[PDB]
């Protein structure tokens, strides 16, 4: 919409107060003009037609329960924008400040979030398995990273390239969570998953097997469920990324950690310069090694650690 940039205030899913960038034109819209070509948040109104209506509010105050998923979708999309621009010099998901669009209140009791090829989409959860999914900054950043992947490597969403696609989203969603630095961890979705159970999550990068996901290539799933296990075999790569960053000994193989920022530089470079739509795990290994070589030198600890990490999860 055409209008003037304003600043609204509201509360997110977890009941936390935050400021949000809005636009005024009769109503206050969830349209942030301060980042790129705009961040826009929409109301899907419990149906599945998308994007729905640009979110409109009469007084620029967003404290109703119905407002909370919108507040967080909008805010955490801005945080994610900031991360890619400030940390990787990437302007929005296409590198050219594409408008970022999100719809919330998608469907009824919908326990998922996704990128549909053009925008982010968030269910409200059924209140049992999930609360509104935009309350999780790692979930929001996971979803926006799917757009980044689609504009760069283009990893096909099936089998090993699809598991890499998923891990890339878990990795950067986690790196965005640490960037924001509010209760950061190597778990995925803990802020919005199972409101009646404490201490669990959708997935764990530090120990994927905690929820039945493989942490070694020898334990890879090869059936046809979940697009050939894209949310399952992602644990093999998530574990590798965790180890690159934090170090550890896994099935007897020791990895010297090099920290989250270097993890992020290496995987961002792999994603944007070396991976292709059909890359498999072995090719991801070579891409990360080449990326680390580009960044830190053939003889660096960093190259050595990437190798140890892929060794540890049985990927040669
Ligand atoms: C964070 C995440 O994995 O979100 C999803 C959920 C909650 C359900 C189904 C698919 C996805 C996805 O983004 O792959
Ligand atoms: Ca209001
Ligand atoms: Ca957390
Ligand atoms: Ca997390
Ligand atoms: Ca829980
Ligand atoms: Zn995903």
Helix/strand/coil percent split, the chain, to 5: 40, 20, 40
302 marked ligand binding residue:
no
State the structure-solving technique. X-ray
Residues labelled catalytic: 143, 231
Residues 6+ apart with CB under 8 A from 35: 21, 78, 81, 82, 85, 92, 100
Please name the residue that has the structure tokens 């009824």: 108
User: Does residue 178 fall inside a structural domain?
Assistant: yes
Q: What is the largest CA-CA distance in the chain?
A: 64
Contacts of 89 (CB under 8 A, 6+ apart): none
Cα dihedral across residues 256, 258, 259, 264: positive or negative: negative
Question: Which helix or strand (DSSP H or E) is residue 262 part of?
Answer: helix 260-269
What's the CA-to-centroid distance between 59 and ligand 4, angstroms? 33
* CA atoms of 109 and 125, how far apart (whole Å): 5
Q: How far is the CA of 302 from the centre of ligand 3 (A)?
A: 26
d(CA 131, CA 72): 12
State the CATH number of the domain containing residue 122: 3.10.170.10
181 and 129 within one domain: no
Distance 153 CA to ligand 6 centre (A): 15
CA–CA distance, 260 with 208 (Å, rounded to integer): 18
**Closest Cα to atom 2 of ligand 1:** 139
Domain-located, residue 1: no
Closest residue by Cα to atom 4, ligand 1, is 113
Task: Check if the beta carbon of residue 81 is closer than 8 Å to that of residue 19.
Answer: no
Contact 180, 260 (CB under 8 A): no
Closest CA to 151 of 254, 261, 275: 275
- Residue 310 has, within 13 A of its CA and on its CB side, a CA count of 17
Quick one: how far is CA 291 from the chain centroid? 21
| Total number of domains in the chain | 2
183 and 125 in one domain?
no
For residue 299, what is the domain's CATH number? 1.10.390.10
Sequence-distant (≥ 6) Cβ neighbours of residue 158 within 8 angstroms: 227, 228, 230
Of 154, 169, 187, which residue constitutes the final position of a domain? 154
* SS3 state at 293: helix
Residue 147 shares a structural domain with residue 177: no
Q: Has residue 30 been placed in a domain?
A: yes
Task: Tell me if 169 is assigned to some domain.
Answer: yes
Compute the distance between CA of residue 196 and CA of residue 201 in angstroms, rounded to an integer.
12
Which of 106, 133, 154 corresponds to the end of one domain?
A: 154
Q: Is residue 26 domain-shared with residue 102, that is, in the same domain?
A: yes
Does 249 lie in the same domain as 145?
no
Question: Of 116, 135, 154, which closes a domain?
Answer: 154
Under 8 Å between Cβ of 20 and 7: yes
Closest residue (by CA) to atom 9 of ligand 1?
A: 112
Q: Which domain holds residue 74?
A: 6-154
Q: Which tokens belong to 307?
A: 């190798």
Contact 38, 5 (CB under 8 A): no
Structure tokens at 201: 């999550």
> 130 and 76: one domain?
yes
**Could you tell me the sign of the dihedral formed by the alpha carbons of 201, 205, 207, 213, in that order?**
positive
Element (H, E) at 225: helix 225-229
Q: Where are the beta strands (DSSP E) in 82-193?
A: 100-106, 113-115, 120-123, 187-188
Residues flanking ligand 1, CB < 6 Å: 112-114, 133, 139, 142-143, 166, 188-189
What's the token pair of residue 316? 């040669």
């Amino acid at each position: 919409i055409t209008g003037t940039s304003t600043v609204g205030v509201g509360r997110g899913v977890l009941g936390d107060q935050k400021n949000i960038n809005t636009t005024y034109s009769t109503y206050y819209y969830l349209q942030d003009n301060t980042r790129g070509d705009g961040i826009f948040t929409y109301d899907a109104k419990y149906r599945t037609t998308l994007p729905g209506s640009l979110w409109a509010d009469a007084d620029n105050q967003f404290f109703a329960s119905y407002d909370a998923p919108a507040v967080d979708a909008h805010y955490y999309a801005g945080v994610t924008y900031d991360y890619y621009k400030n940390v990787h010099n990437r302007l929005s998901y296409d590198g050219n400040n594409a408008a970022i669009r999100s719809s919330v209140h998608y469907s009824q009791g919908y326990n998922n979030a996704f990128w549909n090829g053009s925008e982010m989409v968030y269910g409200d959860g059924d209140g049992q398995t999930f609360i509104p999914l935009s309350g999780g900054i790692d979930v929001v950043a996971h979803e926006l990273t799917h757009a980044v992947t689609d504009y760069t490597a283009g990893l096909i969403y099936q089998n090993e390239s699809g598991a890499i696609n998923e891990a890339i989203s878990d990795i950067f969603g986690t790196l965005v969570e640490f960037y924001a630095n509010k209760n950061p961890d190597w778990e995925i979705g803990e802020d919005v998953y199972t409101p009646g159970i404490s201490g669990d999550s959708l997935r764990s990068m530090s120990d994927p097997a905690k929820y039945g996901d493989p942490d070694h290539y020898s334990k890879r799933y090869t059936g046809t469920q979940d697009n050939g296990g894209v949310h399952i075999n992602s644990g093999i790569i998530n574990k590798a990324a965790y180890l690159i960053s934090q170090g550890g000994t896994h099935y007897g193989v020791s990895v010297v950690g090099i920290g989250r920022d270097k993890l992020g530089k290496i995987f961002y470079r792999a994603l944007t310069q070396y991976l292709t739509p059909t890359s498999n795990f072995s090719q991801l290994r070579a891409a990360a090694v080449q990326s680390a070589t580009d960044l830190y030198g053939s003889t660096s600890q960093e190259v050595a650690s990437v190798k140890q990490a892929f060794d540890a999860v049985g990927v040669k």
